Design a protein around this ligand. Structure first.
Ligand SMILES: OC[C@@]1(O)OC[C@@H](O)[C@@H](O)[C@@H]1O
Ligand SMILES: OC[C@@]1(O)OC[C@@H](O)[C@@H](O)[C@@H]1O
Ligand SMILES: OC[C@@]1(O)OC[C@@H](O)[C@@H](O)[C@@H]1O
Ligand SMILES: OC[C@@]1(O)OC[C@@H](O)[C@@H](O)[C@@H]1O
Ligand SMILES: OC[C@@]1(O)OC[C@@H](O)[C@@H](O)[C@@H]1O
Ligand SMILES: OC[C@@]1(O)OC[C@@H](O)[C@@H](O)[C@@H]1O
Lengths: 88, 88, 88
């Protein structure tokens, strides 16, 4: 089936749910006023996520896997880019 | 194999582990004095979870997926019910 | 594909990413100065993780599943050992 990963922050809260569906990962977002589709859209069959809130900044790391390749995607306030993570 | 998701809160801590096994999701709970089976029991092939502790209240969101359908289940102090989450 | 689980703590942050790949779970670690391979290496087809930071101590629980058997692995400052978790 589709596979999901979820994270949340604050007291509202903000929630992000990532779904790997048919080789594509998309993102659904809740910030207290309805669910909406987020900017994250990248290939993957499996997804995990962690996040940490520091001051006014949310930092999100999404680990997207296809086959034996895992790509880390980073949100640090200014869009998603690939991070330095490697599997070995 | 079976697939799990885990969350924890406080300093004891309380831990919740959700297992998707043969199309059913069940819940195991630790609050510092032994593991026990929790109230959550719903269909699903895949599970993720996030939680946030505010004051004296734990809020838990469990994302249960079967095929391409994901159902959000909500704990806000008074049993589990379906939440407003949709995949699109 | 390979399946991952991730957790993080503090403001650096420290990040741990567990990958179930071909029946084996390994661990990649970030503490602010490069990714490296951690001590955790145990069998499993699926992995989840949760952690909680108390004072100067990180506590990590990794749930490793093979077939219908899930083993909890515990980090409490002194290496990884099996925990009391059972699926029922
Ligand atoms: O629109 C909300 C948003 O900016 O929040 C932070 C990240 O989750 C982004 O992908 C997302 O688009
Ligand atoms: O700022 C991005 C970055 O340094 O954040 C910490 C880790 O997620 C790294 O892999 C990543 O490149
Ligand atoms: O009994 C403990 C319990 O109430 O804790 C909160 C939720 O995890 C419930 O499913 C669970 O039954
Ligand atoms: O109180 C329940 C609720 O509003 O909590 C926030 C989100 O999880 C929503 O999907 C959900 O319906
Ligand atoms: O070397 C860093 C380390 O000790 O951090 C705590 C755990 O993640 C361990 O598996 C890991 O080896
Ligand atoms: O100190 C280890 C332990 O007691 O921690 C809490 C739970 O993870 C238990 O299953 C585990 O045996």
């Amino acid at each position: 089936s589709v596979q999901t990963a979820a994270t949340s922050w604050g007291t509202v809260p903000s929630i992000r749910v990532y779904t790997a569906n048919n080789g594509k990962i998309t993102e659904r977002c809740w910030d207290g006023k309805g669910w909406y589709t987020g900017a994250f859209n990248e290939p993957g069959d499996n997804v995990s996520v962690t996040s940490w809130l520091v001051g006014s900044a949310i930092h999100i790391r999404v680990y997207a896997s296809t086959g034996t390749t895992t790509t880390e995607w980073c949100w640090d306030g200014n869009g998603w880019t690939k991070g330095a993570y490697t599997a070995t």
